[PDB]
Amino acid sequence: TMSEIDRIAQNIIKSHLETCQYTMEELHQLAWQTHTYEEIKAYQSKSREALWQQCAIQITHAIQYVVEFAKRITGFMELCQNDQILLLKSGCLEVVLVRMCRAFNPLNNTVLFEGKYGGMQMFKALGSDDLVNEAFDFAKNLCSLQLTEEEIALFSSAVLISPDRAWLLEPRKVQKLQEKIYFALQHVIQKNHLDDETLAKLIAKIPTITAVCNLHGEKLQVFKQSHPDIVNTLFPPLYKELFN
């Protein structure tokens, strides 16, 4: 039913618009703001634990918005709470990663972090350039598709609503919704992207998204080895709950 597809699309699109930290408008006005040479140096002078703490707070902040996003998607709240938790636990960061492309500037390869745009050197203190570079490469490639907010809303919902996550109790139910979401995304893409490969190029990115987030987990596990007290008593409790 095309009518059901449209109701699902409007619901997700609306949830996205009401659950982003920065509306698309606020971002156009922030993209011109860039951290100065001094500010970049300050970030680089941070201890690895200090910057990790800052990044964990920002990621958690973004993750909390993804929870609000999920809670407003009617089809998601219809799943058993167990699968809701599983989907969020396994995909919150993946959604955040997709959403990051909204606040990324491919012209100079900079991203919004703590109020202004900064390059990858801004994260030098993390001691994880491989992770930063993979995150930036992903954002750059996604940005090249020139997606609209509706498409980012729908695609991000498909990344979250994955029937493939391990341990799901009702994967078919999740599968049925994801199918409808993709059907919606496919129609919405036509309003913009003439010709395309768009939907196919987006779906082909699913594994890369997960790869980046797994790398984040990997770096964090080693971070925990070196600084257990920081993770257990300074990192946001939700961040610890989700990734450690």
Partner: peptide, 10 residues
């Protein structure tokens, strides 16, 4: 997942 559970229940 106490925290995540709480946020969903809000």
């Amino acid at each position: 997942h106490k925290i995540l559970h709480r946020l969903l229940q809000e």
